[PDB]
Amino acid sequence: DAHKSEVAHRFKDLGEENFKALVLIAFAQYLQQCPFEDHVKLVNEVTEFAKTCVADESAENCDKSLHTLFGDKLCTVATLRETYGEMADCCAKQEPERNECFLQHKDDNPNLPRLVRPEVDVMCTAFHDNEETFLKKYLYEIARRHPYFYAPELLFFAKRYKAAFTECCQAADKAACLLPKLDELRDEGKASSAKQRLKCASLQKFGERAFKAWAVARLSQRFPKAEFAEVSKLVTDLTKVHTECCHGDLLECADDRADLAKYICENQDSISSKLKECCEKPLLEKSHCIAEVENDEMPADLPSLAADFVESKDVCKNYAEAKDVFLGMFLYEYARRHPDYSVVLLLRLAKTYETTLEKCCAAADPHECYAKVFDEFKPLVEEPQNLIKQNCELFEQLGEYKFQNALLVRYTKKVPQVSTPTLVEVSRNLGKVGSKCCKHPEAKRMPCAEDYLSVVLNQLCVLHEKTPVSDRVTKCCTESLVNRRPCFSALEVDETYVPKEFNAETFTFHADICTLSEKERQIKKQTALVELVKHKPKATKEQLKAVMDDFAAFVEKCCKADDKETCFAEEGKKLVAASQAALG
Ligand SMILES: CCCCCCCCCCCCCC(=O)O
Ligand SMILES: CCCCCCCCCCCCCC(=O)O
Ligand SMILES: CCCCCCCCCCCCCC(=O)O
Ligand SMILES: CCCCCCCCCCCCCC(=O)O
Ligand SMILES: CCCCCCCCCCCCCC(=O)O
Ligand SMILES: CCCCCCCCCCCCCC(=O)O
Ligand SMILES: CCCCCCCCCCCCCC(=O)O
Ligand SMILES: CCCCCCCCCCCCCC(=O)O
Ligand SMILES: CCCCCCCCCCCCCC(=O)O
Ligand SMILES: CCCCCCCCCCCCCC(=O)O
Ligand SMILES: [Co+2]
Ligand SMILES: [Co+2]
Ligand SMILES: [Co+2]
Ligand SMILES: [Co+2]
């Protein structure tokens, strides 16, 4: 509907709850150093003003744009120059430039102390006694630490956090219930943040064409019944939405997503049969629902790709008159028939086909030259499939924890220069990827692995390039995204590496380990295993196994011993000397 007041407009569309939550997020992301109660006050002022406008749109300042009003509120902050320095100078600018000014002065890494997780009982009491304040303080705390995380997506995590507390605080064992859930949500939060940045970094580092190629592949998988023309229309729209979201303006990004959501829901008949329930959903949820929609089933009578792309005599002619449209159609056709492939695999095939057409269409006899291009696809398809069966079989033999340890040893041996915390975190996450994706049937394993492997390898690459230690990791991280995982898969053992000198404190343990959680204990042991491998990198899988066995016995025994701490000391020096002798 037409509206005199934009803020009254947004308010009625979102509802009061979502509005108040998003305003809090927006303020926390722009003013990261201001305390909670000042933010609560601002939220309440903006919210009370919104409701003035809902009641009377002819009221003072209700006609103003939400950008103008938002900037106006920031500029009423007293300590703005004293706290944010030159951000105060934004206030001397007219509104087109002012929001741009403010947006540039967001601090990606604010110097804020790590957010500590309270005990389960204190959280549950806080949740019980003061639900609104509990949940909003933390929304504030997370938003100010993540100024670029898309606010509506953060709102969606907050609701799952709320759900976890509702269930687990009434449980018999609260901590056994709650802490796994909070660990999952944190992982998904770190993953969502990873993807968002990775989209923008891909788009800038590699450009639209490659971005669109990725999108063609994925949308053809999701929507195999759609005609190429429609897919291409969605890709073009999807590419522009990303472009404007990567600039970081919330309203712009939200409006764009909701336009694309609106388009897709009006054209369900031309896109997918799986959009129905998504398209009934309210504003913020609809775009989010559509992003996570499941693959539609493929049409029945699908011709072979050979006809248009190998056997036609007009392959070169059709290619030459529009190369990207032709390659787009190739990718569209291949992808829609193969939801079981990774997008990157599909892009490798499309790039192979491109390379082949480029040379073969310049040969005296093209039709001959390019007649067996589909043979080049066999190894490309094989390579990821092999690793899947190979890792998921090993996962089934060992279980998550020991699978993780198998990885620790493998990757420490390959890149021993990486810091111990990084190797532990990456190997654990890689372990979970196996734990999650290996449970799927074959058809679903490769897309699963690609998605989760993408965020884990992003997190590694992000960590690494802030503190570089290995050129080989650098090369894998700075390569094309299509080649990133194969580059990492190709890393060999570093036979050059000179062992880390012995540090007795690293391999001394204490009685505290017995009472720690399964998670925390595993981490202390995994830390030690990395260091063991770094100190003895020529140790055989079987030699380490013997040390790992003796260590298990050491823990088990000293955790039943009366005097725990002298056990750990006395037996500990024994295990260490024996191990040193063993691994010589
Ligand atoms: C989107 C966030 C909304 C509210 C979140 C409430 C959760 C608070 C408990 C976790 C605090 C420490 C962070 C963590 O390790 O999980
Ligand atoms: C520890 C806070 C977890 C909150 C999860 C919601 C999404 C926020 C983005 C990523 C949060 C954790 C990032 C970090 O470890 O610094
Ligand atoms: C290039 C600066 C504007 C950033 C645009 C925001 C959208 C991307 C969200 C990424 C959040 C993670 C933070 C980071 O990795 O820098
Ligand atoms: C709604 C987003 C779908 C279209 C994605 C655009 C192409 C960018 C691909 C590069 C980033 C990969 C991250 C991921 O696996 O999600
Ligand atoms: C950086 C490599 C990205 C993948 C390259 C695949 C090449 C074949 C696809 C050509 C681009 C199609 C773009 C489109 O029409 O949407
Ligand atoms: C884009 C810069 C200013 C953003 C903050 C404006 C103040 C209201 C925020 C909440 C309402 C809009 C949220 C949305 O539609 O996604
Ligand atoms: C696979 C179907 C595509 C439809 C998704 C529409 C939403 C556009 C994505 C824009 C990304 C903004 C950042 C984010 O929400 O993570
Ligand atoms: C580290 C164990 C993860 C569990 C699954 C193994 C993944 C191996 C295949 C990787 C495929 C990703 C997509 C691709 O590069 O084509
Ligand atoms: C510091 C750790 C770097 C090494 C870990 C990255 C490698 C994981 C990607 C591939 C995992 C499944 C297939 C494979 O292991 O080749
Ligand atoms: C050569 C230096 C002395 C080594 C002392 C033993 C430390 C290695 C134990 C860590 C691995 C145990 C993990 C497990 O399988 O539970
Ligand atoms: Co309207
Ligand atoms: Co009660
Ligand atoms: Co625009
Ligand atoms: Co080198």
Numbering used by the authors: 1 to 584
The authors write:
HSA is also capable of binding non-esterified fatty acids (NEFAs),15 hormones and drugs, as well as a variety of other metal ions, including Zn2+, Ca2+, Cd2+, Cu2+, Mg2+, Mn2+ and Ni2+.16,17 Based on spectroscopic studies and affinity measurements, three Co2+-binding sites have been proposed to exist in HSA and other mammalian albumins: (1) the amino terminal Cu- and Ni-binding (ATCUN) motif (also called the N-terminal binding site or NTS). HSA and ESA are composed of 585 and 583 amino acids, respectively, and share 76.1% sequence identity. In general, the structures of ESA and HSA are highly similar; both are composed of three homologous domains that form a “heart” shape, have 17 conserved disulfide bonds and possess a single free thiol group at Cys34.19,35,36 We also unequivocally identify the major Co2+-binding sites on HSA using site-directed mutagenesis and examine the effects of NEFA binding (palmitate) on Co2+-binding to both wild-type HSA and mutated HSA forms.
To maximise the reliability of our findings, the structures from four crystals of HSA with bound myristate soaked in 9–16 mM CoCl2 solutions at resolutions of 2.4–3.3 Å were determined (data accessible via molstack; see Section 2.4). The crystals of HSA in complex with Co2+ belong to the C2 space group, while the ESA crystal structure presented belongs to the P61 space group. The only cobalt-bound side-chain common to all four structures is His9, proposed to be a ligand in site B. Residues from adjacent protein chains, which could potentially influence binding in the crystal are also indicated. NEFA-binding facilitates a significant domain I-domain II movement, leading to a rearrangement of site A; His67 moves approximately 7.8 Å away relative to its initial position with the sidechain of Asp249 moving in the same direction. The different conformations observed in the HSA structures, where the relative positions of His67 and Asp249 vary, are likely to influence the affinity of Co2+-binding at this site. However, in each case it appears that these residues would be close enough to enable Co2+ coordination. The position of the Glu252 sidechain is altered in the NEFA-bound HSA structures. Furthermore, addition of 5 molar equivalents of the non-esterified fatty acid palmitate (C16:0) reduced the Co2+-binding affinity at both sites A and B. The presence of bound myristate (C14:0) in the HSA crystal structures provided insight into the fatty acid-mediated structural changes that diminish the affinity of the protein toward Co2+.
